Amino acid sequence: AGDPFVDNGTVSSQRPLRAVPGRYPPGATHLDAAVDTLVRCHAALGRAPSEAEAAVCLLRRLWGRWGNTPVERPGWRSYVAVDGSPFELSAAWNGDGPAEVRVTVEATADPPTPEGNQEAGWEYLRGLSRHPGAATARVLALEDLFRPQTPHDRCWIMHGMASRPGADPLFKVYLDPDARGAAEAPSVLDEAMDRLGVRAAWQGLRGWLDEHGGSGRIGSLALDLADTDDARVKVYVQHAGLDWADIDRQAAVARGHVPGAFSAALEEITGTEVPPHKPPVTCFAFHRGVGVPTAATLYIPMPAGVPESDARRRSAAFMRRSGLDSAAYLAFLAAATGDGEGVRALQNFVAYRPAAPGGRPRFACYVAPGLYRL
């Protein structure tokens, strides 16, 4: 159970995790690092300082109980960031204008154990249920599926908080399809999609995938925790063993598909010379009452056999050619990592959704803070 391409779980001789020098002071907590990084990233994107301050207050309120753990000698290697930190920074560009800043976190127990962490992860949602801008009913209605009495050793649940320019924050949750083991994943997903009122579209997607190259591995079921028409159910499909043209064709089931956009993005960033260390992932979005996915967003891994500096160059160039603010992307990477030189592979994926008629191109980055050696 758990992601076969990256690692997470209890730290030990078999899963080592060592803090890098030159980042935060020796007694610093993950929350200290996250608050500072969040502020720096808002500045790098030219966002309002008052909005940064609000984002910090929100982070402390919702996650401070769990995130105030020492950076040095960690007991758990999280899934949320590629360096194993329990938080990850992200920026999202939806057409022109200031980017959204997002932080995604995991709540760990003291001391961190599968049972304790899973408890903390769902305790987080009880805290969130008290926040007026959050709608947690849809995820709490899934707790008996995703929170077994005995979690697996690599259990995870991730929580996102989005800081939006001139707007209220948005909250998101990412659930582990393997919560009850790999064998139970299909059943868990099926039941969850039933409960969320999107069976038709989900079963439709399942059928479609099986006739266009195979489903792959379901990486997460995620929910927008809002009671608006904009809220979606999201399923992440990890495309192990599929070529770029096939990933592109698989997206045709979703509204807004632009033939060739996904495969061009993959060629321009991941390349066609060496398989990437982990496969690309498509996020299919769903809405109750719609019989097909409403959108498909591609998560593009960095190229294998290519330096990180070149991976950043390719990503920035792709952004520009898409019309988006590549200067802001590079600045954000520097702020999030302290690695302006671009020598550390701290990106998770970059994400892309092409502009459909009447819409805007979208790009997003996801970057670990580089508190730990890779």
Ligand X SMILES: CC(C)=CCSP(=O)(O)OP(=O)(O)O
Minimum gap (Å) between residue 364 Cβ and ligand ILV: 8
After which residues are there C–N gaps above 2.5 Å in the chain?
A: none
Helix, strand or coil, per DSSP, at residue 165? coil
* d(C-alpha 88, C-alpha 66), whole Å: 15
282 binds ligand ILV (CB under 6 A): no
88 or 100: CB nearest ligand ILV: 88
372 binds ligand ILV (CB under 6 A): no
Residue type, 245: A
Cα distances (angstroms) measured from residue 199 to each of 128, 137, 203, 259, 288: 27, 18, 6, 26, 9
124 binds ligand ILV (CB under 6 A): no
231 binds ligand X (CB under 6 A): no
Say which entry of ligand ILV, ligand X, none residue 117 contacts (CB below 5 to 8 A, set by partner kind).
none
Say which entry of ligand X, ligand ILV, none residue 20 contacts (CB below 5 to 8 A, set by partner kind).
none
Residue type, 10: T
How many residues bind ligand ILV (CB under 6 A)? The answer is 18
152 binds ligand X (CB under 6 A): no
Minimum gap (Å) between residue 363 Cβ and ligand ILV: 13
Contacts 24+ apart (CB under 8 A), 245-251: 246/212, 246/213, 247/280, 247/282, 247/298, 249/212, 249/213, 250/208, 250/209, 250/212, 250/213, 250/282, 251/282, 251/296, 251/298
How many residues bind ligand X (CB under 6 A)? The answer is 10
87 binds ligand ILV (CB under 6 A): no
Say which entry of ligand X, ligand ILV, none residue 172 contacts (CB below 5 to 8 A, set by partner kind).
ligand X
Per-position x/- string for 101-130, each x denoting binding to ligand X as judged by CB under 6 A, each - no binding? ---x--------------------------
Query: Which one of 3-11, 107-115, 123-131, 186-194 is the stretch in contact with ligand ILV (CB under 6 A)?
Result: 3-11
* d(C-alpha 224, C-alpha 341), whole Å: 35
- Residues that bind ligand X in the complex, under the rule CB under 6 A: 90, 92, 104, 158, 160, 172, 174, 283, 297, 364
